[PDB]
Symmetry: D2
Subunit: 402 residues, 4 copies
């Protein structure tokens, strides 16, 4: 196919040289991220079962999840939950296949629980949380589905939407991403079971100076007094330092739980390891983009990838693809300092035929856009030709969407 | 004396970028219905707290789920089969000292009043269920006053961030003003078949623009396909008029591109919103505070809708950044483009940000030196008056989506 | 057909001669009665629309409705509701017919609202209540349904259950019944708009002495202070007095809102006219029997008639039928002092073929069971043959089920 | 210490000499019984923990439980649950005690799920059920509670409440009760794990002939084809015949799962062993009275005992009390053929001082009422003196309420 790809130079200062860079990440126990990961765990568990029974992922979109805050009162040595966290699953999934029922609600509720067990280790999943499903019923005749799939080997776009992604990551980006990932590793979680999964990380660079703030819920059953807690914070400090030192020679101030105040009793302790116990809410699409970050020095799509199907929904598929394409361009094409990729769907045309795939590149010093633009074009075109590979990448947990 | 830093922005302006992408979700789109309900509830609660106690009490209603119903649209008039379900959450104050405040009554009325105006053909009594899980809260009023008196200007406890720009490009204005006119009272009186679920996408490449409009058509206003086709024409003509007032670039306009007549497929609905079957919605998934979704620009992830207008730093800074950029673009001769970013200083009042970066591309022939001073000044005046935002919000004088 | 009717004498003292008789009625704004009423409104609205669309009532049972109490703060001149009443509709109904979707939830929610407007006049239906439906889905194919109607003209029984009814009503029962229906008549609500619909009426007769206690919610917006509130109770009192005098010669004490304690500022005032605003809950089947009363001197079925379908559910149909058989016997057969009727279904046989229809009679003095048994028998047999007349009686609002 | 207890002769034919008798029981895994059981489980759990923490039972009522049928696809060898059972807990309880907090929802959720794990053994509580809580809030001052308690050690009635019990049980009553109870016993479940807990038993006696019908959900993972199924029904038949033969010499037909139609492939087959799995619904107070039975030949209260406050809810206390008193008089006083006990509260007064406690005795042949009066009066007066023992019986699981 001749595809609508456009490669242009982007004239601005590269982000490493911009004076003020702000990067955020919401970790895996943060209420918005809990919603994202449930939304996605439901889509994937549904998708796997549809493939198991019928060979093919049937239509669904479970990109709507509300995390409604409970009430709890932590205390050194072990506080308690008073009102449970209430989670609602919605979106839509095929449940009537010909005349038979597919167990959408059973699958969805089990995936949600299974995902939470691993996202918030200290949450009692039977007594601190209620999870209900209001996932909409769709219907399909299976012969119609296969016929439509024979007619269009690359699925048709259902919506007019764009995805966006860029590469490579900056030092501040890499520090932020890796700091939350390290702190929420299974590995680290076995060394310090006081560290809850609700970790927000913020990285603010002014010039060559970086402030890295970590806000991390401590679990009160694992810390019997302010001193145990203070030792926990220090271990978070030392964690972060070795990530910071692996990533920059810039001088860096690290802060943990800045709101604390020993005098007035104030410490960031929680019964469960998420602030969703205390009345903070979450919902899908309010947090990390598909590269795992929130990055106002860069660009983004407002489409929420989590929970959307990986077969036809470009709000997931073109966010993923834009990141993959930007990444291969930054890595494979000498001369690229930065690259931003933006893809807009053409409703009723195949998802590999977008209205545009806009690639915008800042050359390294010395390089002309003219030598960059052919190899950038080819990478983008080849990924577009192979767009249906994102289905399996999703089924096999090979890419993240938040 | 504030950390405002006005410097030049050394970049090709957006108009000279080759590809520009801009989207707006109109008022009856399910994500915007969610955003709108959220902010409606916030504003309702706010006017009632002030009326009763002289002060806005803490709330945040930035959590609204729109779960799609079922419907069978039909030329001549269809029916709703299962009602739309909408959940209100977040939290607010219902105990003030020894008195009680009817949080849930205010929210249900504000939500249902907001939908009545947002989706004109939705039957509120029968096509919708609104459920509240708005969380509880308790306040001692005197203590609240004594914090307000201690700090007239609220203290940050955070590094929160806001970003805004001006002026709008051609393509931005076309997209914004196309949806607004299609959902205007004037237009609805002439063509009441045009529903409020209108999503508009603008793509520019060089000097060619493609504008696509997906507008839910109301099935009781359209007796058959020729009636429907005439409505699409009138959308097309209305957009063409707005396009021509904004640009000389050749522009193609496409309306309801998913339509497939020979298969019987038309964008008709019973109520005028896809929430009735085809779509779910939720808060902070659509338009930013300037009403647009703009991947060529820098955007914040903050969901402004429903956030506390008195102390939510992110809401207030996102609004402020937009107001400051606008005024600079409008007031200062020689501004081609301006971005404002504002970053709070934890502990310090919100009118003393860590930094307020104003970055300007001069129009040709102008130098940054003749722009610096008046820009600094405009930015300082607004920061000084940061508590003004709270009363713009109450008075319905600024939008958050 | 030959049916399993057994008529026998009941040897005991008639209720009018028993020493201690207790009767109770929950009026229409009482939370348990709001549940029954809503259950039955939903079933009737569904039934009416199945008939309109298809000729025939399709299967449903909406005999599950929870009224979950709100919170409110009444005060003279007008209080406020803080948390709304929350009402869940449950049960099941056919929603797919020939792959086509019938608007179960639209009909149910509207019927609930419509019933509540009427049942609690001062309740704000959009801001003081939330109504949600979890009514379960069923499916049918219409040819299948007509072929089965064809084949079984009297529908088959799906359960093994009994109904129970009796006649005639004692003085005490008539007073209790008529006292609540008068105080909740439209006529009287025009005359005294302060009187809420949550009226509980109890009649306790000891020998030839009756204590009639009324508990009636007063609506706080039509009563400006305690003296307006005392006038209203005196109007209630005087109403009851006329009903009492119309029905008995026994001396009778009448008490209205006995928990009132003016000295401590306690008065039964409400914002809406139902106690469901203040946290009293209701559910279906917890109150009045089909004859409108709770009568421990008599006998009853534990089946809840309200919301159950009137085509095949004997848990409704045998409670209605028993009342009707018992009433016609007591009225038409001279010499019947009392008659009690109990009917037990035979699962998978026609509803007019019960396992037993037991009739128990107390003769008037001088009359022998021997001359009562044949006409009692015939009345029962006739009504069993005419059992399907209960459908139209329900559709046309000719009988009450609470 | 002088109470208004009145012993008199009941001049009536005893129930064994009536021609028709009808007795039903809903067993443990039936949806109405699930609801009653969960209600009372949550109350007792709440109570034990209030006692633990504060040395007294704080106010609650959890007599409101809605069991909304799921979807299932039963099959010989092992079927599938398609959509979870949804259970709504309502009522109210105290979560604020002075400046402290009490975890009402965590105790209720755990007690409910624990109750179910016992009640329906093949139900998977993590995947086949959702338990939602709308239990209402409440606040107390603990010295306020103790002062009230110290002042009125026997709690004061606030209205006229009523309870009725009778004894002894008839042959048919004991057959119905013991049949369900043996079929749901540990012992029998061990030997025949194919027998689910959803068992409803109906006994009909006409004269000296009894028909006993047992409807028992059979679990499909335990039964590979219809001959294994039939063998299970045979085992049910035979365990019932044993119960029957030890209780009566009257000839008795036993019927098991009468709805079955092998020619058409219809068997009472389930995945979990309760009909709640497939759209059949349940709620509180729609089933057995506190003696475990539904007895239309008898006088019954409409009170829903399950989940009511065991310190101050008087209808609950008086229906328990009634039954225990009638029982003791039956068992201890030579000459009692049949005995009814009714207790009516005295509005102003402590509940051990009722308006009346009516004890009505049919003497066995040859015995005179006046040899029965005194021992009956003593037993009744002794229990009314010991009204607080019921509280402790409830908390120690030594009485049932359905």
């Amino acid at each position: 196919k001749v595809r609508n790809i456009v490669v242009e130079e982007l004239v601005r200062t590269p982000v490493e040289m911009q004076k003020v860079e702000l990067v955020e990440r919401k970790g895996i126990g943060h209420p918005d991220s809990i919603a994202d990961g449930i939304a996605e765990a439901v889509s994937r568990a549904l998708s796997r079962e549809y493939v198991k029974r019928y060979g093919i992922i049937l239509h669904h979109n479970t990109d709507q999840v509300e995390v409604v805050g409970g009430r709890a009162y932590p205390q050194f040595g072990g506080g308690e939950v008073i009102k449970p966290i209430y989670i609602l699953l919605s979106g839509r999934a095929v449940e009537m296949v010909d005349r038979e029922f597919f167990p959408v609600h059973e699958i969805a509720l089990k995936a949600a629980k299974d995902y939470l067990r691993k996202a918030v280790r200290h949450l009692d999943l039977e007594h601190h949380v209620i999870i209900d499903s209001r996932i909409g019923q769709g219907s399909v005749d299976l012969v119609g589905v296969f016929n439509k799939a024979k007619k269009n080997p690359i699925p048709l776009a259902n919506d007019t939407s764009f995805g966006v992604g860029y590469a490579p990551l900056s030092e501040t980006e890499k520090i932020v991403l890796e700091t939350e990932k390290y702190l929420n590793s299974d590995e680290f979680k076995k060394k310090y079971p006081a560290v809850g999964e609700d970790i927000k990380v913020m990285g603010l660079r002014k010039g060559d100076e970086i402030d890295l703030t970590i806000a991390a819920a401590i679990v009160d059953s694992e810390v019997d007094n302010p001193d145990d807690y203070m030792a926990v914070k220090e271990a978070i400090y030392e964690a972060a330092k070795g990530i910071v030192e692996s990533h920059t020679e810039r001088p860096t101030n690290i802060y943990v739980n800045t709101a604390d105040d020993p005098k007035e009793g104030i410490y960031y302790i929680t019964v469960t390891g998420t602030s969703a116990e205390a009345g903070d809410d979450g919902s899908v699409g309010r947090g990390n983009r598909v590269n795992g970050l929130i990055t106002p020095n860069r660009h983004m799509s407002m489409e929420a990838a989590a929970g959307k199907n990986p077969v036809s929904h470009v709000g997931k598929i073109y966010n993923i693809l834009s990141m993959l394409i930007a990444n291969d361009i930054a890595e494979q094409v000498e001369g690229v300092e930065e690259v931003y990729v933006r893809i807009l769907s053409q409703i009723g045309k195949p998802i590999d035929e977008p209205l545009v795939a806009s690639v915008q590149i800042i050359p390294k010093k010395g390089y002309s856009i003219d030598v960059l633009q052919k190899p950038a074009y080819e990478i983008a075109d080849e990924w577009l030709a192979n767009i249906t590979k994102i289905q399996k990448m999703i089924l096999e947990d090979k890419v993240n969407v938040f």
